[PDB]
Design a protein around this ligand. Structure first.
Ligand SMILES: [Cl-]
Ligand SMILES: [Cl-]
Ligand SMILES: [Mg+2]
Ligand SMILES: [Mg+2]
Ligand SMILES: [Mg+2]
Ligand SMILES: [Mg+2]
Ligand SMILES: [Mg+2]
Ligand SMILES: [Mg+2]
Ligand SMILES: [Mg+2]
Ligand SMILES: [Mg+2]
Ligand code: NA
Ligand code: NA
Ligand code: NA
Ligand code: NA
Ligand code: NA
Ligand SMILES: [Sr+2]
Ligand SMILES: [Sr+2]
Ligand SMILES: [Sr+2]
Ligand SMILES: [Sr+2]
Ligand SMILES: [Sr+2]
Ligand SMILES: [Sr+2]
Ligand SMILES: [Sr+2]
Ligand SMILES: [Sr+2]
Lengths: 160, 154, 186, 140, 95
RNA sequence: UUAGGCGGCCACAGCGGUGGGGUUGCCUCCCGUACCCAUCCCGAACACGGAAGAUAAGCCCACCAGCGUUCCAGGGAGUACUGGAGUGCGCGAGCCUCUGGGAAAUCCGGUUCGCCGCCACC
RNA sequence: AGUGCAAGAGCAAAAGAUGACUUGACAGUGUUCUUCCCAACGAGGAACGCUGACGCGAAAGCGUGGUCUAGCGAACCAAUU
RNA sequence: CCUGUCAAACUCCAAACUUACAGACGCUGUUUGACGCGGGGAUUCCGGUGCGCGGGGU
């Protein structure tokens, strides 16, 4: 299904699992990437991907964009490179679908999405000064798989 | 003491807003009233803010307006110095205008209609879709700004 | 204590001095409470009324100020308790108080107890208090006959400080006689 | 200071947790006073469907009855270090429990203005062993 | 509403804040009010008896006598005058 | 209030802690079961009777802020949100200006280890 | 925790537990709110009174069923007091 | 300990705002009699749109 059906925040917050059943599992494989044993403060450079518009990103896009991002980091910095990326958002919003015309229209559960306000950090990678151009590229690939336009903003990095 | 002037019509105006304007003795566009600056009166003009033009006028401007647009509680009668002298507690328009600004009395209290029925602004106003800070003619005004409007609506 | 959600009892409940549930049923009468309280050595009786910032004691009496009328005996017994109530009841009559309900606090409604003795004393002083005669001790025990007969099993004096050998419930009679007398500086 | 701080025997509870009686007879003879039945709550698969029903019995001994029992009860036991409660109590065994405490315990057992005994006035395992050991027997 | 009972949608108004939990002080349950006195209506969650219809919480009526120990308070629902039977426990003096 | 009784508000009063206080006074712990009363067993408690002892508990007094709570200053924040207005911007979801209001988390420094009423009483 | 049963709410020297006693789950008649916000409308419901008769308690007092909000039915006719 | 997120049927917090009553000002009424009461006559019980806030539905 198209994201056009679930990208906007036009419905109430629907997360209460004690009242919702049959919610599909999350396709998001990982939230902690790179070296999850090392700390974020142990890195000179901290780059984050910032969403420019308030939206809802389905776990399908979340996985795909996170995948196309980290896969690049693995390709350029190796499977054990000195970096660590983070997906700080979790798909809490349960999505329906009315799949009988408009009669008894309350739809059945089809998936989950993460609500992100404009200006928020969806991703945040921590790397060294050298690998800074690879993380920017991974994020460039990442924002190509999510509904909104994004900014690749450097939080810690006067090395330019 | 502030001078209120309705610049926006009644149609589509909220009833509670329209009712306030009527409580402030103003029932038509371009009608003006002199309101004391009290807590009670302040709440009222704040509610009317978007459909009105207000501010404290200069003694001079107030005198010009009173002379030209003030009226008795009943009748055509011109409110000139002689009129003021014979019916009010003052000696002339200036004496009246001073007490009004100093909030010592009211138009009604002196046998005058609470409303100053002004003429449309000569040369036109700054627009009723924007406030003063945005180049419009709505809301609170500078003493110089209010004078420009009132004098323009001589 | 633990957190924001924590509920701390009312002060007089933490202190375990006021049974609020009983207090309500008590106040429902509208009449003043005849607060009957005890101590290891003494016995007190207050006539309390309700007030805007707290209770109002209109007339009280303590076993300590009992000796002020000729009492050379101890102060934690039946004759003592009764007389204290009678004294309090009399001071109450003086203040305009005409009726009351027995408030015994955290004490037990045991038949023939001192709190009931206090009650009988106040009632005798002329106060109208809802009571039950067969829950009050028998007249003689109020006089302190149970203690005289205890001293009968002598061999060793019951009383340390010499008040007397075989004790005197007759003293009770003497004091009651004194209080019921119209004169007396209350 | 030491007087209103030296321990004493609060109570000695001799109990027999059977599970279904005839046992009351022996306790009455060994202790001296009358015993009391013991009920239970919650249904158990070990044939305990009847909630309120006799399962055991107990006897709370106080004063002489307590000591006169301990004189001929303690020798029958081999007191250990771990067998002591944090509040300065100990249970050995037919269970025989001894509740030990300082001179002003009534403060927490009375109705009027009751209060909980402060940690400092609460008896210690060590202070308990000592008091007991200092009366016809050995510790550890 | 899904149901039309008296306690419908009264989850908030008929519930104590955690610290106001437990039995309420007797003082206010015994308070005496005179006829003509203005009184604020507000049910005390902790007090079961002598309540009025929840819909009336927030009203400020006028004591006009009593029935037994409870009071008869006159209020104006919208435009309709009504007499409410209520105990002191759920009443407070205005001002 | 050189230690009491009944309370109001019901944590600013909680939790935890430190120091000080009692010859015929007070409150206690305390001593003790002939009685009134009492324990489904225990004068433990309740009840009654009483002072050899004690200030160690409690209690009263003075004090500490680590936790919890109340309030205050500054920071966050006139931010978030918002009642009124707009031929203001945006494809749009939405945003902005003007006008009237205005948080919360949190940081920091203070406050708070109850206040008050009636009665009794070296 | 428990409090018969949805859900939400109430309750700790209790509204819960245990024990004992008891039949107020009583007769008669009302006030008020609800049903039906505002604003007319029945049955039903509840809160709060009074009269009579009672139970328990030392007593204040509590009991007009179950802590509160569901568990209900007109005229005609029959049976019943 | 640290570190990453949420709630129409969560809340240690908490608006704007809505709302009861009262006072004040304003406006209004005492020949235009208000507020209120009683009676006669209706029509009406297919609505729609904008804006704000929504709930369902791509
Ligand atoms: Cl007492
Ligand atoms: Cl009602
Ligand atoms: Mg005219
Ligand atoms: Mg022109
Ligand atoms: Mg123009
Ligand atoms: Mg709600
Ligand atoms: Mg000390
Ligand atoms: Mg547009
Ligand atoms: Mg038929
Ligand atoms: Mg039949
Ligand atoms: Na169908
Ligand atoms: Na309460
Ligand atoms: Na039994
Ligand atoms: Na001490
Ligand atoms: Na009815
Ligand atoms: Sr929608
Ligand atoms: Sr069809
Ligand atoms: Sr994009
Ligand atoms: Sr003893
Ligand atoms: Sr367009
Ligand atoms: Sr302000
Ligand atoms: Sr009930
Ligand atoms: Sr509303």
């Amino acid at each position: 299904k198209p994201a056009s059906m679930y990208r906007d925040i036009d419905k109430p917050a629907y997360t209460r699992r004690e009242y919702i059943t049959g919610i599909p599992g999350s396709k998001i494989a990982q939230h902690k990437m790179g070296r999850k044993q090392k700390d974020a403060d142990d890195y000179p450079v901290q780059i984050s991907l910032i969403v420019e518009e308030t939206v809802q990103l389905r776990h399908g896009s979340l996985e795909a964009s996170r995948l196309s991002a980290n896969r690049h980091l693995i390709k350029e910095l190796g499977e054990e490179g000195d970096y660590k990326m983070t997906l700080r958002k979790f798909p809490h919003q349960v999505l329906r679908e009315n799949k009988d015309g408009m009669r008894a229209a309350f739809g059945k559960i089809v998936g989950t999405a993460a609500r992100v306000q404009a200006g928020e950090q969806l991703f945040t990678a921590y790397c060294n000064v050298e690998d800074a151009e690879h993380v920017k590229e991974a994020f460039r690939r990442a924002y190509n798989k999510i509904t909104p336009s994004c900014r690749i903003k450097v939080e810690r990095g006067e090395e330019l | 003491m502030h001078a209120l002037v309705q610049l926006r019509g009644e149609v589509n105006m909220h009833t509670d807003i329209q009712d306030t304007l009527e409580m402030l003795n103003i029932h038509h566009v371009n009608h003006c009233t002199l309101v004391p600056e009290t807590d009670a009166y302040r709440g009222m003009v704040a509610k009317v803010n978007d459909f009105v033009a207000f501010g404290e006028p200069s003694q001079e401007t107030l005198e010009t307006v009173l002379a030209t647009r003030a009226e008795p509680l009943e009748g055509d009668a011109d409110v000139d110095d002689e009129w003021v002298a014979e019916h009010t507690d003052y000696d002339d328009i200036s004496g009246l205008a001073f007490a009004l600004l100093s909030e010592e009395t009211t138009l009604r209290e002196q046998g005058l209609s609470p409303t100053l029925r002004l003429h449309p602004p000569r040369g036109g106003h700054d627009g009723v879709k924007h406030p003063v800070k945005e180049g419009g003619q709505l809301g609170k005004h500078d003493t110089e700004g209010i004078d420009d409007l009132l004098e323009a609506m001589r | 204590a633990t957190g924001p959600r924590y509920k701390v009892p009312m002060r007089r409940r933490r202190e375990a001095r006021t049974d609020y549930h009983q207090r309500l049923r008590l106040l429902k009468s509208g009449k003043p409470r005849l607060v009957a309280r005890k101590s290891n050595k003494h016995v007190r009786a207050q006539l309390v009324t309700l007030g805007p910032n707290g209770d109002d004691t209109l007339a009280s009496a303590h076993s300590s100020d009992l000796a002020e009328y000729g009492w050379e005996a101890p102060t934690g017994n039946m004759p003592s308790a009764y007389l204290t109530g009678l004294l309090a009841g009399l001071r109450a009559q003086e203040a305009g108080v005409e009726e009351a309900v027995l408030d015994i606090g955290l004490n037990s409604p045991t038949p023939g107890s001192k709190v009931f003795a206090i009650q009988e004393g106040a009632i005798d002083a002329g106060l109208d208090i809802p009571h039950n005669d067969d829950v009050l001790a028998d007249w003689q025990r109020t006089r302190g006959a149970h203690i005289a007969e205890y001293d009968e099993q002598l061999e060793e004096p019951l009383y340390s400080g010499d008040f007397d050998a075989a004790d005197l419930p007759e003293h009770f009679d003497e004091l009651r006689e004194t209080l019921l007398d119209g004169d007396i500086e209350l | 200071f030491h007087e209103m701080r030296e321990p004493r025997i609060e109570k000695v509870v001799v109990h027999m947790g059977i599970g279904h009686a005839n046992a009351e007879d022996i306790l009455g003879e060994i202790t001296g006073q009358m015993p009391v039945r013991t009920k239970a709550k919650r249904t158990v698969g070990e044939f305990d469907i009847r909630e309120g029903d006799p399962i055991g019995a107990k006897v709370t001994l106080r004063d002489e009855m307590a000591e006169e029992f301990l004189q001929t009860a303690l020798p029958l036991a081999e007191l250990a270090t771990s067998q002591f409660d944090d509040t300065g109590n100990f249970s050995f065994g037919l269970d025989v429990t001894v509740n030990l405490v300082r001179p002003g315990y009534r403060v927490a057992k009375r109705d009027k203005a009751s209060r909980s005994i402060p940690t400092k006035h609460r008896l210690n395992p060590a202070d308990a062993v000592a008091f007991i050991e200092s009366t016809y027997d050995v510790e550890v | 509403p899904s149901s039309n009972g008296p306690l419908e949608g009264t989850r908030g108004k008929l519930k104590n804040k955690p610290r106001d939990r437990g039995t309420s002080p007797p003082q206010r349950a015994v308070e005496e009010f005179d006829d003509g006195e203005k009184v604020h209506l507000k049910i005390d969650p902790s007090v079961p008896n002598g309540r009025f219809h929840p819909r009336f919480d927030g009203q400020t009526g006028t004591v006009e006598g009593k029935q037994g120990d409870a009071y008869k308070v006159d209020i104006v629902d919208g435009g309709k005058e009504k007499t409410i039977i209520v105990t002191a426990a759920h009443l407070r003096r205005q001002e």
